[PDB]
Amino acid sequence: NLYFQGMPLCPSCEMKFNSWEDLAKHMDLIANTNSDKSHVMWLNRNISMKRMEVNELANALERFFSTPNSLSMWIRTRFIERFYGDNPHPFIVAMQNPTKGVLLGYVIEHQHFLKNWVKVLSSIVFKTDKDDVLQYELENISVEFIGYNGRPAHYELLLRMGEALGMPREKILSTQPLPSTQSAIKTWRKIAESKTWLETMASMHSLELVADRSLVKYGAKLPYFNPEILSSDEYPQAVKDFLREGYEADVSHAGEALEMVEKYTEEMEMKEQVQITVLKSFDAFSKYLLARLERGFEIEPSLLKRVIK
């Protein structure tokens, strides 16, 4: 019935296979070659560190793409596993009680991220054939540009945060992204250029889960930052002003986007292709979050020393 529709794609090279067994055989063959890096990295990051038997891997691959069943829930679970799991992202660990350097590293690399964000959302506006998707993304772009009804845009709030931390706007804007922000931006741009608007929507809005304060309810071992920062006299008001935005908005915002992603993925019968691309966006986001931290290292040598202690 779903015999030919249920034929699995390689999550690394995107080749199609007749069964989970054929995919497992392929992945095992390519990963056990000197030349390949991509397939072994994918298996290490998502399945296991130790080498599995083809049938063992076939069952592991099937369980990984079918559980959780809900795409919205699958995206949420994989995001937590990757960034808020047993080994949370080093940027998130540093973000718990951030130094001036952590926060400036955030400002400097995120200014570039926000420029790419509004451009990639604009490609969705152009390529989508769904009015609810177009309305949603135009609201998003408008709020990233002029802000919400007189309030400043997230971009302006970020620049104001940097200025409050002692870095003039002129210096922030003239600072080129670090290589991993560039690499991440290139990946997201190529997703927006070559993939479906639905894949692009899932790839970008899944990242908003980083500031979703509900994540701890689903297994996140840490918040994005210590919520005490939003009330203590320890940080400038501009820091509180910027961080409070994601703190009140992204729980309902990421939820609404992923709800639409789940709906159209069912209609267009593209669950695995969307799952593959979201994982690829997760690899870009981790690199980009590293760039934020490494920018912090440039400003604060003690921050590098602490992370590697």
CB of 36 or CB of 300, closer to Cl ion: 300
Residue 96's binding partner among a second copy, Zn ion, Cl ion, none (Cβ under 5 to 8 angstroms by kind) is none
Residue 214's binding partner among a second copy, Cl ion, Zn ion, none (Cβ under 5 to 8 angstroms by kind) is none
Residue 236's binding partner among Zn ion, a second copy, Cl ion, none (Cβ under 5 to 8 angstroms by kind) is Cl ion
**Shortest distance in whole angstroms from residue 90 CB to Cl ion:** 17
Instruction: In whole angstroms, give the CA distance from residue 240 to residue 242.
Output: 6
Residue 141's binding partner among Zn ion, a second copy, Cl ion, none (Cβ under 5 to 8 angstroms by kind) is a second copy
Question: Where does this chain bind Cl ion (CB under 5 A)?
Answer: 68-70, 73, 127, 130-131, 183, 196-197, 236-237, 269, 271, 300-302
26 in a labelled binding site: yes
CB of 41 or CB of 93, closer to Zn ion: 41
| Residue 10 touching Zn ion (CB under 5 A) | yes
**Shortest distance in whole angstroms from residue 127 CB to Cl ion:** 4
Instruction: In whole angstroms, give the CA distance from residue 251 to residue 60.
Output: 30
Give me Rg for the CA atoms of the chain: 20
110 in a labelled binding site: no
CB of 86 or CB of 131, closer to Cl ion: 131
Residues 255, 217 contacting (CB under 8 angstroms): no
Q: Which long-range contacts (CB under 8 A, 24 or more apart) does 147-156 make?
A: 154/114, 154/242, 154/245, 155/111, 155/114
**Shortest distance in whole angstroms from residue 197 CB to Zn ion:** 25
Residue 126's binding partner among a second copy, Cl ion, Zn ion, none (Cβ under 5 to 8 angstroms by kind) is a second copy
Phi, psi (rounded to 5 degrees) for 9: -95, 145
C-alpha dist (Å) from residue 287 to 30, 181, 281, 306: 24, 7, 10, 20
Instruction: In whole angstroms, give the CA distance from residue 192 to residue 59.
Output: 32
Question: Where does this chain bind a second copy (CB under 8 A)?
Answer: 115, 118-120, 122-123, 125-126, 134, 138-139, 141-142, 145-146, 192
**Shortest distance in whole angstroms from residue 51 CB to Cl ion:** 28
13 in a labelled binding site: yes
180's CB contacts (< 8 A; 6+ apart) are 287, 288, 290, 291, 294
**Shortest distance in whole angstroms from residue 21 CB to a second copy:** 40
154 in a labelled binding site: no
Q: Which of residues 189-218 bind Zn ion (CB under 5 A)?
A: none
6, 13, 33, 70: residue in contact with Zn ion (rule CB under 5 A): 13
Of 28, 302, 59, 289, the residue nearest 184 (C-alpha): 289
| Residue 29 touching Zn ion (CB under 5 A) | no
Residue 183's binding partner among a second copy, Zn ion, Cl ion, none (Cβ under 5 to 8 angstroms by kind) is Cl ion
- Class of residue 224 by CB neighbours under 10 A (exposed 0-12, middle 13-18, buried 19+): buried
Instruction: In whole angstroms, give the CA distance from residue 130 to residue 219.
Output: 33
- Residues flagged as binding site for Zn(2+): 10, 13, 26, 39
Residues that bind Zn ion (CB under 5 A): 10, 12-13
